[PDB]
Design an enzyme around this catalytic site. Structure first.
Site, PDB file in Angstrom:
ATOM      1  N   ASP A 270       0.830  -1.196   0.000  1.00 41.93           N
ATOM      2  CA  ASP A 270       0.000   0.000   0.000  1.00 41.93           C
ATOM      3  C   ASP A 270       0.868   1.251   0.000  1.00 41.93           C
ATOM      4  O   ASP A 270       1.926   1.293   0.636  1.00 41.93           O
ATOM      5  CB  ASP A 270      -0.928   0.006   1.215  1.00 41.93           C
TER       6      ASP A 270
ATOM      7  N   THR B 114      -5.174   7.250  -3.136  1.00 37.72           N
ATOM      8  CA  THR B 114      -4.236   8.151  -2.484  1.00 37.72           C
ATOM      9  C   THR B 114      -2.833   8.069  -3.076  1.00 37.72           C
ATOM     10  O   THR B 114      -1.888   8.594  -2.480  1.00 37.72           O
ATOM     11  CB  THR B 114      -4.183   7.865  -0.982  1.00 37.72           C
ATOM     12  N   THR B 115      -2.677   7.425  -4.235  1.00 34.69           N
ATOM     13  CA  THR B 115      -1.379   7.290  -4.877  1.00 34.69           C
ATOM     14  C   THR B 115      -1.296   7.934  -6.253  1.00 34.69           C
ATOM     15  O   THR B 115      -0.181   8.169  -6.732  1.00 34.69           O
ATOM     16  CB  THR B 115      -0.995   5.806  -5.009  1.00 34.69           C
TER      17      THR B 115
ATOM     18  N   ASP C 143     -14.546  -0.215   4.411  1.00 37.21           N
ATOM     19  CA  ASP C 143     -14.554   0.179   3.005  1.00 37.21           C
ATOM     20  C   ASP C 143     -15.977   0.259   2.467  1.00 37.21           C
ATOM     21  O   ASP C 143     -16.291   1.126   1.642  1.00 37.21           O
ATOM     22  CB  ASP C 143     -13.720  -0.802   2.180  1.00 37.21           C
TER      23      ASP C 143
HETATM   24  N1  LIG Z   1     -11.133  -4.502 -11.896  1.00 36.57           N
HETATM   25  C1  LIG Z   1     -10.316  -3.558 -12.421  1.00 36.57           C
HETATM   26  N2  LIG Z   1     -10.156  -3.435 -13.758  1.00 36.57           N
HETATM   27  C2  LIG Z   1      -9.347  -2.503 -14.293  1.00 36.57           C
HETATM   28  N3  LIG Z   1      -8.637  -1.625 -13.563  1.00 36.57           N
HETATM   29  C3  LIG Z   1      -8.700  -1.632 -12.209  1.00 36.57           C
HETATM   30  C4  LIG Z   1      -9.563  -2.624 -11.549  1.00 36.57           C
HETATM   31  N4  LIG Z   1      -9.444  -2.417 -10.225  1.00 36.57           N
HETATM   32  C5  LIG Z   1      -8.580  -1.384 -10.052  1.00 36.57           C
HETATM   33  N5  LIG Z   1      -8.137  -0.917 -11.233  1.00 36.57           N
HETATM   34  C6  LIG Z   1      -7.183   0.205 -11.422  1.00 36.57           C
HETATM   35  O1  LIG Z   1      -6.267   0.270 -10.325  1.00 36.57           O
HETATM   36  C7  LIG Z   1      -6.014   1.633  -9.979  1.00 36.57           C
HETATM   37  C8  LIG Z   1      -5.874   1.785  -8.468  1.00 36.57           C
HETATM   38  O2  LIG Z   1      -4.915   0.847  -7.985  1.00 36.57           O
HETATM   39  P1  LIG Z   1      -4.387   0.878  -6.462  1.00 36.57           P
HETATM   40  O3  LIG Z   1      -3.472   2.064  -6.277  1.00 36.57           O
HETATM   41  O4  LIG Z   1      -3.881  -0.504  -6.127  1.00 36.57           O
HETATM   42  O5  LIG Z   1      -5.720   1.132  -5.592  1.00 36.57           O
HETATM   43  P2  LIG Z   1      -5.978   2.530  -4.831  1.00 36.57           P
HETATM   44  O6  LIG Z   1      -5.866   3.589  -5.901  1.00 36.57           O
HETATM   45  O7  LIG Z   1      -7.368   2.375  -4.260  1.00 36.57           O
HETATM   46  O8  LIG Z   1      -4.885   2.581  -3.791  1.00 36.57           O
HETATM   47  C9  LIG Z   1      -7.171   2.455 -10.525  1.00 36.57           C
HETATM   48  O9  LIG Z   1      -6.673   3.582 -11.252  1.00 36.57           O
HETATM   49  C10 LIG Z   1      -7.930   1.529 -11.454  1.00 36.57           C
HETATM   50  O10 LIG Z   1      -7.934   2.059 -12.782  1.00 36.57           O
END
Ligand SMILES: Nc1ncnc2c1ncn2[C@@H]1O[C@H](COP(=O)(O)OP(=O)(O)O)[C@@H](O)[C@H]1O
Lengths: 499, 514, 499
Positions: B48, B81-82, B382
């Site tokens: 994360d 948040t990234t 969540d």
């Molecule tokens: N089922 C999915 N299909 C396609 N893209 C996805 C899917 N789930 C997440 N993503 C992509 O992953 C990105 C976020 O990844 P991550 O950084 O691991 O989660 P978060 O942003 O919640 O921390 C998003 O921009 C999204 O486009």
């Protein structure tokens, strides 16, 4: 040679050079020690106050700037820049083998010519109420156009105008007082006919109080008054503490009985009240106010002609006041004591909201400038144009006067006129436009015969200052010029070693 | 002058770029892991971005500003948040080449603000609104936005808790929500996790006593906050102890001293007392507990400050202190108490709280082996977070890289249409929007440039076509995959990134210190 | 950056900066090689001619200065100082981030304004005979007041005036010619109505020659003419040398017989005559003149309408002259051939005496300036005042014109006006007086409204230039300004690397 103090005084003026004009640059002030703080400022006064130097000329300049800021409004950066430019010019003038006496004489002549030109160029067309209203509005708009924050300026300007216009030409500075309170939104303004407190004891005490009558009783319970009912402590055993406590309790109960038989309902004071007398007053049925400010009781007694009891001296000689309606309305996010039901509308306190800080300082500065310009122009309106119009006229007058005096002081007047034509250049450079062409066009328009010509900050062109609507104060520029000339004459007269 | 502020800005930009590049291979479900090493030698595997951002420490104004921005983004929205760090890094990289030519920062800031406003208006005009006044559409939106956060079995396991938590219909579709104002999800060890149900009133887990019958209804809470500790002595032994005399004195001080206080306190009705945590008391006199066993005994310990704040808010009372108190503002509500276990270990009492002004209801969850309790807690967290995010607005859109390419093309056409020297700066924004799809294509295992070009061609041809798939590993339409996201998670992120960029660009000059 | 050529061109102007004004500084020019020579000079032309540089811009400037010198007379130091000041101003103007196009436009405008002010300020009051006389006297006195040598100036000035006034408005430069001759005293001046030679064969030849008749015979004895009486040499023995000698002897004796039967008494020529024909002519009774100069026979044929015989071509076509009285009077310390008894008083040569050198150059320069100012002002007198009067007026006109042109070329005009007000400063500094106060007083007098105000070199005060009596030329200053502007525009256009 002499160069150390000159460089030390010049370098201290270039630190706040980028903080001029409405579009100024911001900087951070990192702190050392244990916890490193970080804050964003946009004013030269806070930077000059939270700094430490060691040069004599630099310390003198800082003290003069602080004195000038305490005197008038925001006059700290302009005077510093002018003094730095004057010192930079005087250094090159001395390097050309020129005696300082001729330079001082030329600077005095240039200052006299500038003062004469400023006194001979003063408008006076204000024989109506709408004229004074629009003049005050333009002054407030020009004063509030220094941070470039287009979010809530018109409403605050109107509120400040309505608050400063209720004085009706009354010369006083202790009636209108502002407080500090945050919480809410920026678009929230509350209007009232009185003032509020700043601390509440709670809600456990009864709030139903009828027949408002202010009674200032300066009865001290730990100040050793006449006829002490108690005593000290001896060295024999540990049983005298109970006797001292009982004596203090009976003394405070006698004082409570006296203040009850004297006739009171809302007890207010400013001394330190303990927990036992406060609880006794709450159980009796009289609300006691403790932990008062240093200016609340003073401003409350000044507007009503009252005064303190002189630490219990003459209770039948000090005149006391009375009100009609006193309650506690829950407004905003805190419960305060209201001061309504009065016929004196001179003392008012407008509470403010929002989620930002560093606003009370600029608010107080704007109110000070407003009441100053109101008491100065009570019957003789004197206002000048802004945007770089008076400086160009003063420089032109100095250049015209520096042509019929044969001798050797003309170079000093030329250097003074050259240094005086630098504030509009820095103002135009801080925005991001061509300053040289604008300065040349302004000089050509002033030499051709146009006393109403200024620069625009919205588009970067050259237009008239009397059509758009922008003015300022009259004594502020004169005081700035006088302080700059005095600082230059003081610093230039020193050239010997620092001993 | 000019060299010092330029060098300061260059150093700040380099530090921000290094901070942004320290972590980048973690966006998407197929992200890489990172082993952070502690100062003592311990290693921890994590993936994360928030954990890595909050664990590392570095002293720098730009780094602290980025950390504060990430914290504000995580507090406000709560998801993604990234990507804000990458957006800020791309904007700073564009501003670097913008300032290398010779442009004033004011025009660049104005162009950035105009581009942000245009992108926000395009995102608001492109998204489609839904409805939520009834329960069928709300449940459909919940079950459509909940089947795309974790794996299939975890989703099927959290679906009962999700539909139990979403049933809390209190606000009649207002502007904001209060899901973080009156929620206190407790945790209990022992039993089966299937025995879960919404509980009102108050839930405790400390044994009251161990005497006869303790089934009464006397407010069920003792509003007391005065000191109950024993008076400590000045030293160990004040005199020499051996025979009697000193023994009788301490015996009377231990038996006939605090008992007088207990008697003078118990003279008031509702004999219900308690105490906070036993973090400062060495040992409590058991003689007082034996003497209090008669005329009804009720005492509950192990109480924190959050529990006191929850009790004083759900019931609607205010605690009192001091000894000299002759009032009567300490009662509560009497209904039912004295609960037993639910066929298992672990003591836990519940009160439904009938006839109370506060309708605060919580969820009492359980578990076993401390393995499925924290997972369910994070799942329901969540769940209610995304529920609040969806109820805050009504707009929604799908992710994958299509909105980014659409916004980039719109900004390009706007810079081509709009006239002025600032348009070039706007073009910089057109080069600061195609980073997320390229990173996703690189992490998936395909050609990023070819995929980006194909997506741009499809967007220029058929407007809304498809995006980037992860499960199948190709280019498929998003309408078949049940995956969506609210519009706030993008609008708020873009606004915060633009504000941070403007703040880091407006700050320059010299950085004086003490 | 560009600084190498600018420094190289500026440093070359500061070498002769102290050689301006009547009270200039002297310096020595130590030579290297085998014999180290030592001499004292007081002119920038001789220093710039006997020097060697390597910079392209410096070489171009030196060539332009030498061309302007050989064109006008004197002014190399002045134009070099002006170009150096212009380049020093242009360097500081470019360092302030200013495009060279605006600088060139401002310089062109300033030059046009200066030319207009110089053309609009021209006197023309000379309708009397004594007016031109006093004007020429003042011009000669101002030109001869550059070395500060009060020993024999009035007599030489009167002699030069009388020699340049005999032309009577005739446009010619080949009639009056001067020679170089030393020996005697400075207070010795000889007046004649003709010219002299420069070489005498001796006294052994008869000097009694009657009936003067100039006969230019270009009969060459070793130029291989038509019908060679001799032949070459063979390769067989060493006896043909006597035959060749006898053939040459009989050929030269036949040529002598021919030149005797043609009718001649005073034979003059310019070819190389051997010892045998010269001895034969001396024994015959005809004086032969050999080793002639390159300008004596040419001027003699020009003032008499004659020409050379074209190396024996048409003897019955070239017109010849004749005189009346020709003798050899022992004057001074050498015997020369006199040329009296003529009615043409246009060609005259005044012999000079003394025990000093470096006088013929300044004499020729003064005569050139005199005949130039005489042929220019044949019917339209145009003279201006000196002592630093025209430069101040030009600077004032440039400063007044640089005030109604809004834009960005005003700084170039200001720099030009500042650089133009530096020659009087250097002039006053070279003497040993306060230059700043004098310059300030002159500027004040010019700005108050006094076009006739200059500085005095005898006491160091400020007086009128029309009362004392001092003037100069008109086209000289205009040509100097034009050449300086052209050189500045040429040098300023170069800034790239030297490849
Ligand atoms: N089922 C999915 N299909 C396609 N893209 C996805 C899917 N789930 C997440 N993503 C992509 O992953 C990105 C976020 O990844 P991550 O950084 O691991 O989660 P978060 O942003 O919640 O921390 C998003 O921009 C999204 O486009």
């Amino acid at each position: 040679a002499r160069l150390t103090s000159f460089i030390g005084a010049i370098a201290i003026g270039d630190l706040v050079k980028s903080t001029l004009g409405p579009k100024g640059m911001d900087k951070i002030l990192l702190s050392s020690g244990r916890d490193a703080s970080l804050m964003v400022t946009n004013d030269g006064a806070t930077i000059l106050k939270n700094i430490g130097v060691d040069n004599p000329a630099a310390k003198v300049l800082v003290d003069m700037s602080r004195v000038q800021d305490d005197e008038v409004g925001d006059g700290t950066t302009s005077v510093t820049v002018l003094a730095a430019e004057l010192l930079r010019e005087a250094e090159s003038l001395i390097a050309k083998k020129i005696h300082p006496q001729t330079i001082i004489a030329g600077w005095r002549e240039a200052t006299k010519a500038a003062r004469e030109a400023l006194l001979s160029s003063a408008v006076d067309h204000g024989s109506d109420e709408v004229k004074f209203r629009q003049d005050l509005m333009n002054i407030a708009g020009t004063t509030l156009s220094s941070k470039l924050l287009t979010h809530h300026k018109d409403h605050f300007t109107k509120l400040a105008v309505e608050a400063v216009l209720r004085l009706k030409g009354s010369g006083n500075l202790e009636a209108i007082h502002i407080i500090k309170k945050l919480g809410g939104s920026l678009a929230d303004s509350y209007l009232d006919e009185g003032f509020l407190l700043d601390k509440k004891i709670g809600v456990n005490q009864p709030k139903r109080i009828e027949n408002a009558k202010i009674l200032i009783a300066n009865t001290g319970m730990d100040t050793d008054k006449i006829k002490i009912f108690g005593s000290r402590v001896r060295v024999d055993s540990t049983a005298k503490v109970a006797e001292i406590e009982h004596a203090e309790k009976e003394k405070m109960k006698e004082k409570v009985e006296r203040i009850l038989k004297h006739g009171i309902n809302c007890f207010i004071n400013r001394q330190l009240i303990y927990n036992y007398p406060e609880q006794l007053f709450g159980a009796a049925g009289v609300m006691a106010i403790e932990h008062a400010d240093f200016a609340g009781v003073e401003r409350l007694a000044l507007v009503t002609g009252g005064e303190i009891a002189s630490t219990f001296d003459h209770p039948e000689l000090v005149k006391l006041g009375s009100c009609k309606l006193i309650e506690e309305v829950m407004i905003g996010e805190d419960k305060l004591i209201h001061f309504s039901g009065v016929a004196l509308g001179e003392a008012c306190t407008i509470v403010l909201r929002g989620a930002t800080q560093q606003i009370l300082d600029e608010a107080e500065r704007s109110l000070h400038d407003a009441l100053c310009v109101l008491a100065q122009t009570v019957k003789d309106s004197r206002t000048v144009y802004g945007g770089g119009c008076s400086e160009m006229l003063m420089a032109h007058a100095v250049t015209q006067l520096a042509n019929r005096t044969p001798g050797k002081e003309a170079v000093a007047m030329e250097s003074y006129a050259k240094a005086l034509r630098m504030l509009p250049t820095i103002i135009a450079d801080n925005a991001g436009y061509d300053s040289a062409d604008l300065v040349a066009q302004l000089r050509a328009a002033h030499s051709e015969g146009n006393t109403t010509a200024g620069l625009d900050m919205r588009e970067g062109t050259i237009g008239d200052m009397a059509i758009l609507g922008i003015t300022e104060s009259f004594q502020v520029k004169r005081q700035v010029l006088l302080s700059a000339a005095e600082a230059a004459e003081v610093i230039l007269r020193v050239d010997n070693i620092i001993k | 002058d000019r060299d010092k502020p330029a060098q300061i800005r260059f150093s700040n930009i380099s530090a921000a770029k290094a901070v942004a590049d320290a972590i980048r291979t973690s966006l998407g479900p197929k992200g890489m892991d990172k082993m952070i090493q502690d100062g003592k030698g311990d290693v921890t595997i994590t993936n994360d971005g928030a954990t890595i951002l909050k664990q590392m420490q570095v002293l720098h104004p730009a780094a602290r500003m980025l950390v504060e921005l990430s914290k504000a983004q995580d507090i406000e929205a709560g998801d993604g948040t990234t990507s804000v760090v990458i957006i800020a890094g791309s904007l700073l990289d564009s501003c670097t080449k913008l300032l290398q030519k010779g442009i004033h920062p004011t025009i660049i800031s104005e162009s950035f603000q105009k581009a942000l406003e245009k992108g926000i208006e395009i995102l608001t005009d492109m998204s489609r609104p839904v409805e939520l006044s009834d329960r069928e559409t709300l449940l459909n939106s919940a079950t459509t936005s909940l089947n795309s956060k974790v794996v299939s079995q975890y989703s099927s396991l959290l679906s009962p808790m999700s539909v139990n938590a979403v049933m809390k219909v209190i606000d009649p579709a207002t502007a904001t929500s209060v899901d973080l104002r009156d929620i206190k999800i407790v945790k209990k060890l022992g039993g089966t996790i299937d025995d879960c149900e919404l509980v009102e009133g108050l839930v405790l887990t400390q044994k009251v006593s161990n005497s006869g019958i303790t089934r009464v209804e006397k407010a069920k809470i003792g509003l007391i906050q005065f000191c109950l500790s024993a008076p400590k002595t000045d030293m160990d032994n004040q005199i020499v102890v051996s025979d009697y005399a000193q023994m009788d004195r301490v015996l009377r001080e231990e038996r006939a001293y605090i008992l007088n206080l207990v008697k003078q306190i118990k003279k008031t009705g509702c004999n219900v007392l308690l105490i906070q945590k036993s973090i400062l008391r060495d040992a409590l006199s058991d003689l007082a507990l034996h003497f209090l066993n008669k005329m009804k005994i009720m005492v509950i310990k192990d109480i924190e400050r959050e529990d006191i704040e929850f009790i004083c808010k759900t019931i609607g009372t205010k605690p009192v202190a001091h000894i000299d108190q002759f009032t009567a503002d300490m009662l509560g509500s009497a209904e039912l108490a004295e609960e037993v276990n639910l066929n298992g270990s672990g003591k836990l009492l519940k009160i439904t709280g009938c006839a109370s002004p506060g309708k605060t209801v919580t969820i009492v969850v359980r578990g076993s082996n401390k393995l499925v309790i924290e997972e369910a807690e994070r799942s329901i967290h969540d769940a209610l977070c995304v529920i609040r995010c969806l109820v805050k607005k009504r707009a929604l859109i799908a992710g994958g890289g299509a909105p980014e390419i659409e916004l980039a093309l719109r900004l390009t056409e706007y810079s081509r249409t709009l006239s002025g020297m600032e348009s070039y700066c706007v073009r910089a924004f057109a080069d600061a929007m195609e980073v997320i799809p390229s990173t996703l294509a690189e992490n998936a295992g395909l050609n990023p440039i070819s995929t980006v070009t194909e997506l741009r061609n499809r967007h220029a041809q058929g407007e809304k076509t498809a995006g980037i798939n992860v499960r199948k590993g190709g280019i498929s339409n998003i309408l078949e995959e049940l995956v969506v996201q609210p519009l706030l998670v993008s609008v708020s992120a873009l606004t915060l990134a633009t504000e941070t960029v403007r703040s880091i660009l407006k700050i320059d000059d010299v950085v004086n210190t003490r």
